[PDB]
RNA sequence: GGUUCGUGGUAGGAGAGCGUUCUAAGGGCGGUGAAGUCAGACCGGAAGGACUGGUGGAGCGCUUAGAAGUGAGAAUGCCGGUAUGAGUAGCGAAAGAAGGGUGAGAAUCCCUUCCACCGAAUAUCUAAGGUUUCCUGAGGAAGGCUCGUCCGCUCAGGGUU
RNA sequence: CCGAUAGUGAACCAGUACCGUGAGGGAAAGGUGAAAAGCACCCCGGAAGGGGAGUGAAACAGUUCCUGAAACCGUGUGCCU
RNA sequence: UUAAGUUAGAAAGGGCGCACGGUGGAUGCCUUGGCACUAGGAGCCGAAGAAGGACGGGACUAACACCGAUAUGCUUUGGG
C-alpha cells in the first residue's frame, strides 16, 4: 500500500477525507497516486453499504466523515454522507459485483506537474 | 518566403527554454503545437505563443498556407541577466542570476 | 600628454590568436593559452625542420636497403660498392630509382657489384 | 570537494548528451481530429477519444 | 666595393630600431565614406606595415623634428563583464482535503465544509522600537526562495478627533 | 593638461545612495536623431514581446536608443571522430 | 550457395573550419565636467541676527532651482 508522503494518521485522515468527497460529489479531480488508493477505500465503503446491516452501517460510520451532503425538506432534516452511502449510492450498485469506481487520466497540473485523474462512481 | 517571431527578454533561463525548443525544431507547426501542449515545462506555454505569433505573421503578412508550415529555425539567445543576492550563513551573500531569454521561431512553407 | 592603451594591444593579441587557428578549444580563442601554443608551435617547427632532413634520409635508406636485397646486396655493401665505383648519386635519387625505374637501380647495383 | 580544473566546453557538452526531453506519446483523435495523449481523455472533444464522458 | 675570422646565451654592458598620444612645419586623405571595428591566402630580418572588402558615419594620415601619463600575461594586482562547478546544493522546524468561485492562466487568491495545530499561547492588551507598513480601488515588470488573479510589493486616493 | 576605469570623490539632483551607535567611510551611473518626424493602422498575444505598415539618410538609430571588441552563449553545416 | 580474405559506410554526442546571431561594453569619435596656471580685481561675514540649515510658497508638485506667510515673487530705476 502507498505511503502518500504522509505519516500514518495524516494518511488515514487524507483517505477518510477523499473517500467522503467521492461519496458526496460522485466525481472528484485528484492526483493519480491518491486516486489509486481511494478506489480501494471507497469500494470497501460501498460494499458495507450493500451489506446494509447495523454492524456494516457502524463500520462505515467509523470511517466516513460527518459531512452534511444536503438538506432535503419533508421540518427540513439534513442528510449526512453516511445516509447518502446507505440510502442513495450503495443500492445503485445492487447487481454490480465490484468495480464501482473508474479513474480517467486528465493531465499534469501547472504548479507541480502532478499527474491528475478524475475518479468517479459507476 | 518564411515568417519570424521573437519573444525578447522573457524571464526564463535560456538552458530551461532550449531543452523544450529542441523538441519542435523541424516539426510541422500542427505537430509542434501539440508537442508544446503535452510537454509539461514552464518554457512550453512561452514557446507556444512565439510559435503561434510566427504562424499568424506567416498567415497575415505573407499569405502563406498555415496547413503547409514547418518550424525552419527555433533558437533561444541569452537576454540581459538580473543580478540578485541570497543571504547565506556567516553574513555571506551568494549571487543569484535571474537570467532572461530571447526566444526566436521561424516557420517556412516547405 | 596622456597616452591611453588603445588599439595596439588588441591588434597584437588578435594576430597571435589567429596563428592558433585550428588548435583545440581555448587554445584558438584565448590570448594567454593561444600565445603559449603559438610559441610552442614555432619551437616544434624549428626542431622539426632539422628532424625532417634526418627523417627523409632514414626513409630513403630503408627503400634502398629493400631494392638492394632484391639484388642480393645489403645497403652497406651497395653504398660501399658505389663509393668504390665512383658513383655520387645521393640516397634521395637512388630511393627514387628503387621505386620508379628499378631497371636503372639494378644497373647501378651492377656497377656496385663490379667495384666489389 | 571542489573542481580541480574547470570543465571544458567539449566535456560539458558531452555530459549533457543525455539531459534532454523525450517527445510526448500522443496521437491524433478520430472525433476531435486533434492530438492527444494515449490513455488520456481528449479535452478538445471533451471526452475519452470517441467514448463520450 | 672585396678577402679573412666570426654570429648558443641568464644577470648585465653597448648599439640600432618598431609602435603609441601630443606639438610644430610642410605636404596630403576624407560623405565618391575619416577614425574605430570585422575578415582575408599580401609586404618587411624583428618590433611591425599595407591593400581589398564588410560594418561605421566624421574626422585622420604621411614627412622631418620635438615632447612624453609611450607598449602588460603574471603583482593571492584593482574595476567591470562572463564562465566552470550545474540544472547540481538549497528552497529556513509544522496537515491538509475536496467542492464551488474568480481569472488569459490557479496545489499556491476568495468562499464553503470537513480535517489538523497553539491555548501561562501560536490568544487578548500595553510600552519600546519601526514610521504609513493601516483602509479602499487598480496592478502583476521587479520584490516574495515555487506560483500568484494575491501581498507588509507597485500606482492612485484616503485614514489618527 | 584629462577626455567618462581618465579628469575632481562627484560631466549624471554626490558628499547623494549605501555602510556605521558615532566620529567617520563613501560609490556606480555621459551619447536616439538634423528635427520627435518618438512607429497612425493591421495582425498574434492578458500583457510583455514581436511581424507588417509608416517616419527617417539610417530603426541592425525605437525613449538608457553613436560605435559596438573579447570572454561567454547559441543555430546551421564542409572535413574528421 | 558454402568457405576464406579484404575493404566500405555509420554520429548518441564531440572536434576543427566557416557563416549568421545573442550577450557584453572594450575601442574610436564626441563633451555638458575637471586640472594647472597667467593678468587684473577682491581678500571677510556676524546681535541691523552670520555660516549653515528646517519647514514652507506653483492650478495640479515627488525632486532640483528660485523665493519667504508680500513666498515660482512686490516696488522702483535703467536696459531690451
Ligand atoms: Mg498519533
Ligand atoms: Mg546574521
Ligand atoms: Mg647527415
Ligand atoms: Mg655557433
Ligand atoms: Mg648572441
Ligand atoms: Mg586619434
Ligand atoms: Mg603606461
Ligand atoms: Mg587581466
Ligand atoms: Mg555534482
Ligand atoms: Mg544528487
Ligand atoms: Mg534535493
Ligand atoms: Mg518554508
Ligand atoms: Mg505549559
Ligand atoms: Mg493591507
Ligand atoms: Mg516569482
Ligand atoms: Mg492585488
Ligand atoms: Mg571618475
Ligand atoms: Mg567609452
Ligand atoms: Mg548601441
Ligand atoms: Mg521697465
Ligand atoms: Zn477526441
Between vectors from CA A21 to CA A20 and to CA A27, what angle results, nearest 5°?
Answer: 130
Helix (H, G, I), strand (E, B) or coil at D36: strand
Q: Give the whole-angstrom CA distance, residue A83 versus residue A75.
A: 18
Give the three-state DSSP class for D20: coil
Q: After which residues is chain C broken (C to N over 2.5 A)?
A: none
3-state secondary structure of B69: coil
Query: What is the rounded CA–CA span in Å between residue A68 and residue A65?
Result: 9
CA A102 to chain centre: 12
Q: How many CB atoms lie within 10 A of CB C55?
A: 10
- Chain D residue numbers touching B16 (CB-CB < 8 A): none
Reduced to 3 states (helix: H, G, I; strand: E, B; else coil), residue C14 is helix
Quickly give B46 CA vs E139 C1' distance in Å.
22
Query: Residue C59: which of C32, C89, C94, C29 has the closest Cα?
Result: C94
- Domain of B90? 2-108
Read out DSSP for A11-48? Answer: HHHHHHHHHHHHHHHSEEEEEHHHHHHHHHHHHHHHHH
Question: What's the rounded Cα separation, in Å, for the pair B108 and B38?
Answer: 23
Report chain A residues whose CB lies below 8 A from the CB of B38.
Answer: 107
Statement: the CB of A96 is under 7 Å from strand E: no
Segment (H or E) for C42 = helix C31-69
CA dist., res. A42 & res. A22, Å (int): 8
The total number of structural domains in chain B stands at 1
Cell numbers placing D47: 471526452
* Method for structure elucidation: cryo-EM
Q: Where are the alpha helices (DSSP H) in A52-117?
A: 54-61, 81-84
Give B94's DSSP letter: E
- C111: helix, coil or strand? helix
Q: Do B34 and D34 touch (CB under 8 A)?
A: yes
- Write the secondary structure of C46-100 as one string of H (helix), E (strand) and C (coil): HHHHHHHHHHHHHHHHHHHHHHHHCCCCCHHHHHHHHHHHCCCCCHHHHHHHHHH
Q: Judging by beta carbons within 10 Å of its beta carbon (0-12, 13-18, 19+), is residue C14 exposed, middle or buried?
A: exposed
Query: D46 Cβ partners below 8 Å, 6+ apart?
Result: D53
Q: Any idea what the Cα angle at residue B78 is, between residues B76 and B79, rounded to 5°?
A: 115
Q: Which residue is associated with the grid cell 470517441?
A: D50
Going from the Cα of D23 to the center of ligand 21, the distance in angstroms, rounded, reads 20
Rounded CA gap, C102 and C93, in Å? 12
Residues just before a chain gap in chain A (C–N exceeding 2.5 Å) are 74
Q: Do B23 and D21 touch (CB under 8 A)?
A: yes
Q: Give the C-alpha separation, D4 to D11, whole Å.
A: 14
- Do the bridges between strand A115-121 and strand A27-31 make them parallel or antiparallel, or are there none, so unpaired? antiparallel
Q: Is C40 helix (H, G, I), strand (E, B) or coil?
A: helix
Disruptive mutation site among D13, D15, D21, D28 for chain B (greatest number of B CBs within 10 Å)? D21
Report the DSSP beta bridge partners of residue B82: B98
Strand G interface, C 4-63, C-beta < 7 A = 4-7, 10, 21-25, 28
Q: Give the residue among B72, B85, B88 at the shortest CA–CA distance from B26.
A: B72
CA A57, CA A50: separation in Å to the nearest integer?
10
C-alpha cell at B91: 553574513
Q: Are D44 and D35 in contact (CB under 8 A)?
A: no
Task: Work out the number of other CB atoms within 10 angstroms of the CB of residue B13.
Answer: 20
CB C79 within 8 A of CB C98: no
CB spacing of D40 vs A107 below 8 angstroms: yes
Nearest CA among A100, A62, A66, A63 for reference residue A81: A66
* C39 touches C71 (CB < 8 A): no
Copy the grid coordinates of residue B53. 505569433
The answer, for D2 touching chain B at a CB cutoff of 8 Å, is: no
How far, in Å, is the CA of B87 from the C1' of nucleotide E160? 38
Q: Enumerate the residues of chain C whose CB falls inside 8 A of the CB of residue D9.
A: 25
What crossing angle do the helices spanning B29-37 and B43-60 adopt, rounded to 10°?
160
Please give the DSSP secondary-structure letter assigned to residue B109: -
Handedness of CA A102, A104, A105, A109 (dihedral sign): negative
Residue identified by cell 516547405 is B110
| Chain A residues with CB-CB distance to D40 below 8 A | 104-107
Residue ranges covered by each domain of chain D: 2-53
Q: For residue B101, what is the domain's CATH number?
A: 3.90.470.10
Sign of CA dihedral B77, B44, B31, B107: negative
Three-class SS state of A3:
coil
**C82 φ/ψ angles, rounded to the nearest 5 degrees:** -65, -40
CB B18 within 8 A of CB D16: no
Nearest alpha carbon to residue C115 among C75, C84, C80: C84
Residue A62 DSSP code: T
| Euclidean distance between CA atoms C113 and C95, whole angstroms | 18
Query: Reduced to 3 states, what is the DSSP secondary structure of residue B83?
Result: strand
D24 closest CB neighbour out of B19, B22, B38: B38
- Distance of CA C29 from the midpoint of ligand 18 (Å): 25
Distance CA A43, CA A102 (A): 11
What is the 8-class DSSP label of residue D47?
B
User: What whole-number distance in Å separates Cα of residue C71 and Cα of residue C99?
Assistant: 14
Question: What is the spatial distance, in angstroms and rounded to an integer, between the CA atom of C41 and the C1' atom of E39?
Answer: 24
Pairwise CA distance, residues D43 & A90, whole Å? 31
Report how far residue C1's alpha carbon sits from residue A56's, in angstroms, rounded to the nearest whole number. 103
Decide if B47 contacts B16 (C-beta within 8 A). Answer: no
Q: What gap in Å lies between CA C98 and CA A104, rounded to an integer?
A: 85
Q: How far is the CA of B109 from the centre of ligand 16 (A)?
A: 45
Q: Is D44 on the interface with B (CB under 8 A)?
A: no
What's the sign of the alpha-carbon dihedral B2, B8, B11, B13?
Answer: positive
> How do beta strands A115-121 and A68-71 pair?
unpaired
Amino acid at each position: 500500500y502507498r505511503k502518500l508522503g504522509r505519516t500514518s494518521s495524516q494518511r488515514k485522515a487524507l483517505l477518510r477525507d477523499l473517500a467522503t468527497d467521492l461519496i458526496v460529489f460522485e466525481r472528484i479531480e485528484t492526483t493519480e497516486a491518491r486516486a489509486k488508493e481511494i478506489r480501494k477505500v471507497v469500494e470497501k465503503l460501498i460494499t458495507s453499504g450493500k451489506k446494509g446491516d447495523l454492524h456494516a452501517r457502524r463500520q462505515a460510520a467509523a470511517f466516513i466523515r460527518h459531512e452534511v451532503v444536503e438538506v432535503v425538506q419533508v421540518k427540513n432534516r439534513p442528510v449526512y454522507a453516511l445516509q447518502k452511502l446507505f440510502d442513495d449510492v450503495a443500492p445503485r450498485y445492487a447487481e454490480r459485483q465490484g468495480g464501482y469506481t473508474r479513474i480517467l487520466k486528465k493531465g499534469p497540473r501547472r504548479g507541480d506537474g502532478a499527474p491528475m485523474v478524475i475518479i468517479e462512481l459507476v | 518566403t518564411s515568417a519570424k517571431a521573437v519573444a525578447k527578454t522573457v524571464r526564463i533561463a535560456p538552458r530551461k527554454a532550449r531543452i523544450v525548443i529542441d523538441l519542435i525544431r523541424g516539426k510541422q507547426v500542427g505537430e509542434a503545437i501539440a508537442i508544446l501542449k503535452y510537454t509539461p515545462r514552464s518554457a512550453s506555454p512561452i514557446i507556444e505563443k512565439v510559435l503561434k505569433s510566427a504562424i499568424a505573421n506567416a498567415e497575415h503578412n505573407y499569405d502563406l498556407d498555415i496547413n503547409n508550415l514547418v518550424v525552419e529555425e527555433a533558437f533561444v539567445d541569452e537576454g540581459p541577466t538580473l543580478k540578485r543576492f541570497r543571504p547565506r550563513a556567516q553574513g555571506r551573500a551568494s549571487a543569484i542570476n535571474k537570467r532572461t531569454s530571447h526566444i526566436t521561431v521561424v516557420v517556412s512553407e516547405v | 600628454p596622456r597616452v591611453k592603451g588603445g588599439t595596439v594591444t588588441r591588434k597584437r593579441r588578435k594576430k597571435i590568436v589567429k596563428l592558433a587557428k585550428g588548435y583545440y578549444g581555448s587554445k584558438h580563442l584565448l590570448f594567454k593559452v593561444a600565445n603559449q601554443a603559438v610559441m610552442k608551435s614555432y619551437q616544434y617547427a624549428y626542431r622539426d625542420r632539422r628532424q625532417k632532413k634526418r627523417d627523409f634520409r632514414r626513409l630513403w635508406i630503408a627503400r634502398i636497403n629493400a631494392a638492394a636485397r632484391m639484388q642480393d646486396l645489403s645497403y652497406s655493401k651497395l653504398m660501399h660498392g658505389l663509393k668504390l665505383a665512383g658513383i655520387d648519386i645521393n640516397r634521395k635519387m637512388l630511393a627514387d630509382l628503387a621505386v620508379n625505374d628499378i631497371a636503372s637501380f639494378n644497373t647501378l647495383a651492377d656497377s656496385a657489384k663490379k667495384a666489389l | 570537494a571542489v573542481p580541480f580544473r574547470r570543465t571544458s566546453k567539449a566535456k560539458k557538452r558531452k555530459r549533457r548528451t543525455h539531459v534532454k526531453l523525450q517527445l510526448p506519446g500522443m496521437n491524433e483523435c478520430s472525433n476531435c481530429g486533434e492530438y492527444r495523449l494515449s490513455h488520456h481523455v481528449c479535452p478538445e472533444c471533451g471526452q475519452y477519444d470517441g467514448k463520450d464522458v
